[PDB]
Each structure stands twice: as C-alpha cells, then as structure tokens.
Amino acid sequence: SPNGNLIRMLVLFFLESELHEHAAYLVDSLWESSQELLKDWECMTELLLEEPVQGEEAMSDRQESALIELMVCTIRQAAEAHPPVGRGRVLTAKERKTQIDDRNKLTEHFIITLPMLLSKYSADAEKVANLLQIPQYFDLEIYSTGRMEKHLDALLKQIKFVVEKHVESDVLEACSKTYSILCSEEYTIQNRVDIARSQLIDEFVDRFNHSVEDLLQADDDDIYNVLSTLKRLTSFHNAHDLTKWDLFGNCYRLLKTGIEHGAMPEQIVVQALQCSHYSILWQLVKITDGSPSKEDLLVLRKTVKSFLAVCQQCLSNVNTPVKEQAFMLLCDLLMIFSHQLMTGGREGLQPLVFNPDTGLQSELLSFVMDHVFIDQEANKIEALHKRRNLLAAFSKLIIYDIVDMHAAADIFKHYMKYYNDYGDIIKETLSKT
C-alpha cells in the first residue's frame, strides 16, 4: 500500500512536529485536500493488525496510539460531515451522498475489524478507550441487515474481556457507553446486547457482594477485590439502571464502616459515594415517571436522608478526595431534592424535599474556605477547574437560599478583599506598562 507510506508519515508528522496540537485539528485541516486518503480505513486497520514484513520497520507503541487516534478522528469527520468542536452548516447533495456512503463504508468495515482491533490492543488502556469511541458512529441497522450477528457477538466478547481486565475510569466509561449505544436501535440486537450486559453485571455484582463480605467480616486483596469490582459497577451505574441489584445496601455498609472506624481506603469511599448517588438518581427517575404510593416516596426519603447524613459525615474524612466527592454530591442532592422537585404538577413529591439544617450549611461553607480558596504543571489547571466546579455547584445553593446566602457573601467579600482594596491601583498600573 503506497497509501500506507503516506499514513505512516502522517503519523510521524503529527508526533514529531508541534504544528498540530490536536489530532482532530490536523484531520480537519487536511480534510478538504486529502479526504480520500484519510478515509482509507482498510489501510489503517491493516497497518495496525498485520505483523511487520521483512525489511519493514515496525511501528512503535506511540505511533500505533497516534494512528488509532487519527483513525477515530477521520471516522467522526466522515460520519458527522462537519469540522470538530472549536473549528465549526448545510450539506450539498453530493456531500450528503458522500456522508451516507462513508457511514456505510466505516460501519461495515469496523463491525468486522473493531473486535480484531480490541483483541490485539486489549491491554492498552488509552488505545481501547479510543477504539471504543467508534461504535457511536455506526449505522447499527447493518448488524441485522448484513447478517453480521457473529460480529456483534465478537464485539460483545471483546468488550467483556476489556471490562474484566481494566479498572481505568476512561476505559470503563467507554465500555458503558458502548453498551448503551448498542441498545439504541432495533429490538432484535437490543435483546442480544441486553443478555450480554445483564450477564456481565450479574458476574460483577456477585464478585462485589462476595468481596464486601470478605472485607467487612483486612487484606490487600480484600481491598482490591472490593475497589476493582465497585469501580466497574460505579462506571456502568451512570448510564445503566442497576437498581434491581441492591448496590446501595453494600455501598452504605462500606461508608458506615469507614465512618465509625475510619480505616476504609479513600478510593473505596469515593466509589461507594458515587455508586450510591447513581442509585438514588435512578430511584428518583422510576419514582417520577410512575404513579408511586405514600410508601414508595417515604422509602426513598429514608434512603436519601441516610445518604445525606453519610455525605455530611464524609466531609470530616482525612482524605481531601473524599471531602470533594461528598461536597459535590451534597450540592447535587440539595439542589435536586429542593423545592425545585415540586415543579410541573408534581406537588406529590413534597415528602422528598430536603432542607439542610444549620450544621450542614456551616460545614458546606467550611469546605469552600479550606478547599476552594486555598493558598497552594498540567495538574494545576485541572485542580483549578475542579475547584471552580466545586464553587459553581455551591453557588447554586446560594442563589436559591438553600444555604445562608449572607454568610457566603461574607466569605466572598473576605477573599475578594485585595481586589476591593487595591484592585483599582493595580489595574491602572498594569495598563500603563
């Protein structure tokens, strides 16, 4: 493949030079002139899947990662037929025809080759997370049309292998999204994916339940067995309703054990808090869409009240990731279960309304002082945007007077004191320089 040499050098140009920071911007800039080369997906998957021939240099691991990332960018650009975010709308008749044929080409090719790609690179977390961004651009009807049921089985097989081998959050999130996508088209393949997903969840709920009992009744393995299985269940509980498995019960036991004795690892606490939050959100969805009874509402109220106390108690955990996690869920729940919940003819949801007492408001205000306004490279701007999200989620409680909006203003005036006292002098000084 002479196109193979061009693809190889394009990967080299993207890695060796600093002219293009993002792969999506490089693909977009060359899309007008090199669209046919950038859509030779048969050539890209052959470079990734075939072994080097005699006299040919093997691709390094970084070049294979860049080729995968570039390949996914071309898949998006061909399927969506518009530049990526940041570079952005009527398509001509030919462009719409090109999009339909592109969508058909990439769907048939990657329904076959994505299982092969996932199998070869199953251990590489960054590569698998990128490869799992591909099914969202599939024309999923082809699974039934082209009689490609065996390739759906091969994809479901490789996703389960990926879930079983990985604990990274981006990998587990990409697997969860792929399961959600595969159940969003037609019921014949929806039922086949539901069977594979439910069996995958059943196997990890059993392993999680057995690990929780091993831990509470500790070893390094006991800690890993709980954390690793809880990570996969927490990642799937966002997009998948896992309430038929009573996951809140064991998460509550883990959090209560960590509150009394204070020996629970921080990441088990963070995952247990997040998993419990997801369970509550799904329980609210089911209780909202249906016609619940008085017992249904008060059962969820008992659950939310006990979890609000756990999040408040977790604010005193020695580990700051637990504080931030509990604080984010506090600001989330106090906004969801406020009087906002009674909008749109849903006054029957009043028993689910919660008002934070004085002690909780004071502890929420304390977190802002010690963990949002702190004294003291790529992790600095990430922690800054994290603290901004923490303050933004807390500011919504201020606007609607869920917390003491006056006590929060005095905290704001305190940390803005240098700007109100010397800001005018500093502004006009930096202007004339």
Numbering used by the authors: 459 to 546, 550 to 678, 683 to 841, 855 to 911
The paper states:
The complex consists of a tripartite ring comprising SMC1, SMC3, and RAD21 (also called SCC1 or Mcd1), which associates with a conserved peripheral fourth subunit that, in human somatic cells, is represented by two paralogs of the Scc3/STAG protein family, STAG1 or STAG2.
We have designed constructs of STAG1’s N-terminal and central region encompassing interaction regions I and II, and IV, respectively, and obtained crystal structures in both the presence and absence of the corresponding RAD21 peptides.
